[PDB]
Amino acid sequence: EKLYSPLKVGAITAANRIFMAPLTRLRSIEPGDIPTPLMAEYYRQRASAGLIISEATQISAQAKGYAGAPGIHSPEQIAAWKKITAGVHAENGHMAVQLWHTGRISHASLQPGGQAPVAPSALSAGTRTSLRDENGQAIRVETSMPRALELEEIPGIVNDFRQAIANAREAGFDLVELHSAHGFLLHQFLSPSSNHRTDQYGGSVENRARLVLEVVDAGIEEWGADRIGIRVSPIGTFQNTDNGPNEEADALYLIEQLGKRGIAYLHMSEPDWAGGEPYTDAFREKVRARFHGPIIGAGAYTVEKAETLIGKGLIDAVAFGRDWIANPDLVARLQRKAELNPQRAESFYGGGAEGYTDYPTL
Numbered sequence: 544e545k546l547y548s549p550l551k552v553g554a555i556t557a558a559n560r561i562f563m564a565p566l567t568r569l570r571s572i573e574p575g576d577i578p579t580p581l582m583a584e585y586y587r588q589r590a591s592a593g594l595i596i597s598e599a600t601q602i603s604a605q606a607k608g609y610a611g612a613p614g615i616h617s618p619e620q621i622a623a624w625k626k627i628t629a630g631v632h633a634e635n636g637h638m639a640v641q642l643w644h645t646g647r648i649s650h651a652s653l654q655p656g657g658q659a660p661v662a663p664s665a666l667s668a669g670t671r672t673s674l675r676d677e678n679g680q681a682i683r684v685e686t687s688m689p690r691a692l693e694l695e696e697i698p699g700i701v702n703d704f705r706q707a708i709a710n711a712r713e714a715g716f717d718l719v720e721l722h723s724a725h726g727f728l729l730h731q732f733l734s735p736s737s738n739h740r741t742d743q744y745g746g747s748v749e750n751r752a753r754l755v756l757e758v759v760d761a762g763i764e765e766w767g768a769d770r771i772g773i774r775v776s777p778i779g780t781f782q783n784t785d786n787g788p789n790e791e792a793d794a795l796y797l798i799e800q801l802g803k804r805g806i807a808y809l810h811m812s813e814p815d816w817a818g819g820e821p822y823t824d825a826f827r828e829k830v831r832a833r834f835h836g837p838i839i840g841a842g843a844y845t846v847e848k849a850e851t852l853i854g855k856g857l858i859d860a861v862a863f864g865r866d867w868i869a870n871p872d873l874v875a876r877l878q879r880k881a882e883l884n885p886q887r888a889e890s891f892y893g894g895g896a897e898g899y900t901d902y903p904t905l
């Protein structure tokens with residue numbers, strides 16, 4: 544029954560330990576990347592989660608890499624998100640917004656002026672992103688060759704994250720999750736494989752972690768450390784982007800830096816679901832010694848794996864992804880040991896209510 548006990552996460556208190564991982568569903572209105580009342584119903588159905596982490600959300604127009612993914616930089620996006628957050632809070636839910644810059648995982652057709660996406664270095668992501676075809680449905684297309692960010696542009700990236708954090712507060716979100724994982728811009732700077740810069744944002748691990756820590760510091764000054772969460776995937780390979788040959792020592796450095804700032808939480812995307820060997824207990828203990836706030840584990844999790852790790856004090860909560868897609872009352876189903884609805888993966892991305900808001904409760 545430890546999974547169902549409250550947990551203080553920053554400035555709020557989650558009602559339980561069963562969190563909803565960020566889940567890109569690509570159902571926003573285009574043009575504008577505007578959240579919809581359908582998305583509002585989708586998140587309202589899952590308000591029983593201790594903490595809802597929204598789908599990844601653009602901090603700016605340049606940050607767009609997925610067609611149909613929402614933003615939170617324009618006034619109409621802010622107004623739409625405010626309706627979504629108010630609905631979750633009315634059902635005693637709590638919600639954070641995941642802010643991302645896709646970086647090199649993007650397509651030129653989605654960028655301002657149709658130009659090349661930006662990245663720490665001009666290196667192809669070697670993977671695909673999702674566009675929308677003539678019918679409006681999601682299609683996979685290889686990512687465009689990115690442009691190396693000039694040193695002069697980096698303060699603009701930090702200001703885009705800061706403004707999005709201020710926008711998140713105006714839209715009524717409880718917390719912010721910086722998306723520093725899964726091969727996107729913040730992770731691209733962290734990884735030695737994707738960061739070949741020779742200025743103070745490349746090379747050493749403190750240089751590779753400089754940008755993300757400047758964003759954390761800007762978020763602390765903008766709103767407060769108890770409002771800033773961060774998601775990392777520092778061990779393994781995600782979307783053809785590995786963490787370099789010194790991944791364990793580089794992960795512990797970044798985590799220690801985040802731990803000193805006393806941020807809201809650390810959300811770790813583990814290599815299990817991505818096809819990799821899981822964390823050892825020795826590594827989790829090294830993480831716990833360097834990060835004191837709540838730790839959220841995600842990726843190929845089960846209730847038994849969550850209860851064991853929480854019992855050992857290695858993590859404080861678990862974030863489920865696909866199980867929340869198909870089960871709007873996942874907390875009640877897990878508590879009552881009930882079976883879960885089958886997942887309809889063909890309707891994960893794009894489309895409308897089908898495979899989105901039409902999953903039944905118990």
Ligand SMILES: Cc1cc2nc3c(=O)[nH]c(=O)nc-3n(C[C@H](O)[C@H](O)[C@H](O)COP(=O)(O)O)c2cc1C
Pocket residue numbers: 564565566567568598599641722724725774812816841842843844862863864865866891
């Ligand atoms: C449809 C789908 C969309 C996802 N979108 C995001 C996202 O926007 N941001 C992110 O950090 N992870 C994203 N992920 C990864 C999940 O958040 C999480 O790492 C993973 O799904 C958890 O493993 P689980 O599904 O077995 O519980 C997504 C996963 C799926 C299946």
